Design a protein around this ligand. Structure first.
Ligand SMILES: NCC(=O)N1CCN(C(=O)N2C[C@H](CO)C[C@H](C(=O)Nc3ccc(Cl)c(F)c3)C2)CC1
Ligand SMILES: *[C@@H]1O[C@H](CO)[C@@H](O)[C@H](O)[C@H]1NC(C)=O
Ligand SMILES: *[C@@H]1O[C@H](CO)[C@@H](O)[C@H](O)[C@H]1NC(C)=O
Ligand SMILES: *[C@@H]1O[C@H](CO)[C@@H](O)[C@H](O)[C@H]1NC(C)=O
Ligand SMILES: *[C@@H]1O[C@H](CO)[C@@H](O)[C@H](O)[C@H]1NC(C)=O
Ligand SMILES: *[C@@H]1O[C@H](CO)[C@@H](O)[C@H](O)[C@H]1NC(C)=O
Ligand SMILES: *[C@@H]1O[C@H](CO)[C@@H](O)[C@H](O)[C@H]1NC(C)=O
Ligand SMILES: *[C@@H]1O[C@H](CO)[C@@H](O)[C@H](O)[C@H]1NC(C)=O
Ligand SMILES: *[C@@H]1O[C@H](CO)[C@@H](O)[C@H](O)[C@H]1NC(C)=O
Ligand SMILES: *[C@@H]1O[C@H](CO)[C@@H](O)[C@H](O)[C@H]1NC(C)=O
Ligand SMILES: *[C@@H]1O[C@H](CO)[C@@H](O)[C@H](O)[C@H]1NC(C)=O
Length: 343
């Protein structure tokens, strides 16, 4: 059985619950099938295959799915896509992502790279074939990748072209770092929140990230700086928790000084009603946050970085956190997968 590289229309599988009102469950109930009860990958003996996580149509297909899911599930009170102003009801929803499997139709298979040091591009020497990917949670965020999978050996640097500073860098961690975010109790500032992180763990992992980046940039000095301009979605770590949009200041995470800084790091945050959408250009206005304690505990599993340009003539490389193109979030999980057509 031989194959060739090809794109095709995939379908999706999930474990959505019948009567759950959570928006991810409802969308999967009507747009996905139940997950494969007996999956078994086929190892391809002595096969080496090339992959390119930055040129992978699975990413675009997942992007279209998550756009469609958010479009049917989140209802803003006011939607402003340039000039036009749509007003409607904005009930609060139940929101928590569930795993989605992407699967091939007849005549196609997914090749899976099992190399534990695979960086996302180039050859792979331990290859298997599957009918479906694993369950991928579609977490929308900027700056930090949340609730993903971990690199199995070392910290992995991913980029389409590291020399080109316009190309985003995905840092894939091998040890997750918890981020615990709370909008407490109540009143009438209901938007003020905070995220707590173990500073010992975070600064240890950041140290390891800098050393790994030194390996790629001629043992140069590595400097982290906060973003340099942009809207709040770019300059802040943005994510959705229980349907509410949190914006968190990550200045204390990207400080090169760390000494007397081994305690809990408290990130100031705020819940925003007016957000610049990631699906398409436009603003959306939601209703004020629900009452009660709003809390999310997540795993930081990767970091999105942009390297500063114009530093060739210096001894430093400066890196800033940088989300915005949600495709890279899906890429960080689909990197090991590629679709081929069974000849
Ligand atoms: N047309 C194809 C395309 O690629 N895009 C369409 C338009 N986009 C955009 O304008 N921005 C800029 C905007 C700031 O100005 C922030 C956008 C963004 O990340 N928002 C965002 C919202 C909520 C959450 Cl929870 C989140 F984590 C992120 C990217 C998205 C990119
Ligand atoms: C290939 O990958 C598998 C995981 O699917 C794992 O046992 C190991 O990393 C490799 N095994 C062999 C026999 O090469
Ligand atoms: C990934 O590995 C390939 C070798 O297969 C190499 O050519 C490429 O530059 C690597 N990229 C990074 C970011 O390490
Ligand atoms: C967080 O990470 C731990 C180990 O790193 C893992 O066991 C746990 O399932 C992760 N939590 C989530 C929500 O993925
Ligand atoms: C993670 O990777 C780094 C190298 O980048 C290594 O020093 C460290 O020991 C690894 N941690 C684990 C838990 O494997
Ligand atoms: C990578 O980027 C650098 C700088 O933009 C460029 O000189 C080089 O040709 C690029 N390599 C590829 C394969 O595009
Ligand atoms: C998260 O933080 C809240 C308040 O700061 C605390 O009550 C809760 O126990 C924390 N949970 C974890 C898992 O750290
Ligand atoms: C913080 O991280 C360190 C090292 O990972 C760990 O020993 C400690 O239990 C964690 N929690 C606190 C409260 O220090
Ligand atoms: C984050 O906090 C620092 C001070 O703690 C402040 O200077 C900075 O403006 C804040 N970030 C944003 C995007 O407002
Ligand atoms: C990460 O997973 C935990 C457990 O499933 C969940 O409570 C949390 O809300 C998730 N975080 C995000 C940002 O989806
Ligand atoms: C900066 O780096 C790029 C890619 O490595 C190179 O093409 C360019 O000549 C360098 N310096 C300047 C001043 O352009």
């Amino acid at each position: 059985p031989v194959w060739k590289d090809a794109d095709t229309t995939l379908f999706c599988a999930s474990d959505a619950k019948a009567y759950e009102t959570e928006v991810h469950n409802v969308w999967a109930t009507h747009a996905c099938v139940p997950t494969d009860p007996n999956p078994q990958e086929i190892h391809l003996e002595n096969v080496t295959e090339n992959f390119n996580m930055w040129k992978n149509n699975m990413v675009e297909q997942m992007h279209e799915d998550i756009i469609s899911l958010w479009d049917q599930s989140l209802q803003p009170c006011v939607k402003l896509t340039g000039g036009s102003v749509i007003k409607q009801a904005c009930p609060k929803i139940s929101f928590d992502p569930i795993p989605i499997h992407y699967c091939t139709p007849a005549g196609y298979v997914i090749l899976k790279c099992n190399d534990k040091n695979f960086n996302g591009t180039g050859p792979c020497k331990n290859v298997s074939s599957v009918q479906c990917t694993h369950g991928i949670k579609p977490v929308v965020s900027t700056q930090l990748l949340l609730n993903g999978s971990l690199a199995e050996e070392e910290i992995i640097i991913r980029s389409e072209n590291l020399t080109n500073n316009a190309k985003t860098i995905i840092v894939h961690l091998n040890k997750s770092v918890e981020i615990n975010c709370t909008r407490p109790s109540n009143g009438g500032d209901i938007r003020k929140a905070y995220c707590e992180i173990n500073g010992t763990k975070w600064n240890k992992v950041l140290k390891q990230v800098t050393e790994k980046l030194k390996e790629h940039f001629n043992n140069k000095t590595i400097i982290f700086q906060p973003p340099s301009g942009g809207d709040l979605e770019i300059t802040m770590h943005s994510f959705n928790c229980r349907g509410e949009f949190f914006y968190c200041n990550t200045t204390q995470l990207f400080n090169n000084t760390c000494k007397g800084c081994n305690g809990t790091i408290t990130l100031p945050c705020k819940i925003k009603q007016i957000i610049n959408m990631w699906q398409g250009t436009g603003q959306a206005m939601y209703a004020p946050p629900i009452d009660g304690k709003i809390n999310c505990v997540s795993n930081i599993t990767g970091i999105l970085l942009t390297r500063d340009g114009g530093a060739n003539n210096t001894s430093n490389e400066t890196f800033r956190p940088g989300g915005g193109d949600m495709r890279d979030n899906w890429r960080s999980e689909l990197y090991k997968y590629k679709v081929v057509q069974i000849e």
